[PDB]
Design a protein around this ligand. Structure first.
Ligand code: HEC
Ligand code: HEC
Lengths: 127, 127
């Protein structure tokens, strides 16, 4: 869907921006600094689930740019493993949210964050 | 969910970027220049539906910035009417996609595009 590689870069960066907001806005809730409303979090995690499927199709070969490290394309299987494992972690977060289980939510939230970081550490250029 | 107004601006611009990609990527399909696969379009419109609900909460009072025109906040009811009417147009597009009806899809797609433009004309600053 991208006329030029720059369009893929802009897309995946915007998807990431939205993921960071929908993930990060739950930090106060999982810390107990903001109240836990199960329906609110269920709905937010459903947005995050949709968003968290979106970046990967925007790393389609030849879309080097931005802060993607080159290793994404040359090790396609390993990058796919990491995005699939991340989306798996999002499924666990969805299950916790859908159950209204705050303890499971906290644990799942931590695992998701670790998965974001693990991918960035391997595949995102430093600043 | 925004620490500063700049964060709301970045969010709503990124949401718009994704909406433009998910809407605009169907142009060749509605023109017949690309093939029509009903399942593909159904899934894409479901992404667009999720995305098209997201910008509005990121124009929460005092978030002047970016290319929002000031009129968004001082005429809250009129801006709300336009976003709700736009989301209505997205419901029509969803119905067409879910029905697998290409003629209804074309018509709905045009109405959605007109709704995007009508809001920009009133509420987005020129370049
Ligand atoms: C690999 C499987 C990733 C996972 C899992 C997550 N992210 Fe990511 N992210 C990844 C890459 C390769 C890039 C660089 C994209 C580019 O072309 O520049 C990013 C980028 C981000 C950013 C920065 C976006 C920008 O402003 O330019 C953010 C804020 C970000 N990613 C957030 C994020 C979160 C919150 C994640 C888990 C919920 C997450 N990413 C997972 C690769 C991967
Ligand atoms: C009002 C109810 C709007 C509707 C409906 C749509 N858009 Fe919009 N859009 C709106 C505003 C006020 C702004 C400016 C945001 C800011 O703070 O700068 C925008 C912006 C865009 C952009 C530019 C994003 C950027 O790169 O900075 C795009 C590409 C965009 N909008 C696309 C878009 C599409 C495709 C829409 C219908 C499917 C649509 N917008 C509707 C307000 C409104």
């Amino acid at each position: 869907q991208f006329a030029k590689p720059e369009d893929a870069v802009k897309y995946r960066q915007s998807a990431a921006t939205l993921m960071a907001s929908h993930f990060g806005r739950m930090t106060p809730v999982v810390k107990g600094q903001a109240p836990y409303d199960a329906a609110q979090i269920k709905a937010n995690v459903e947005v995050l689930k949709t968003l968290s499927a979106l970046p990967w199709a925007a790393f389609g070969p030849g879309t080097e740019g931005g802060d993607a490290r080159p290793e994404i394309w040359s090790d396609a299987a390993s990058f796919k493993q990491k995005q699939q494992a991340f989306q798996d972690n999002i499924v666990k977060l969805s299950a916790a949210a859908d159950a209204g289980d705050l303890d499971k939510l906290r644990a799942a939230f931590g695992d998701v964050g670790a998965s974001c970081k693990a991918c960035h550490d391997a595949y995102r250029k430093k600043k």
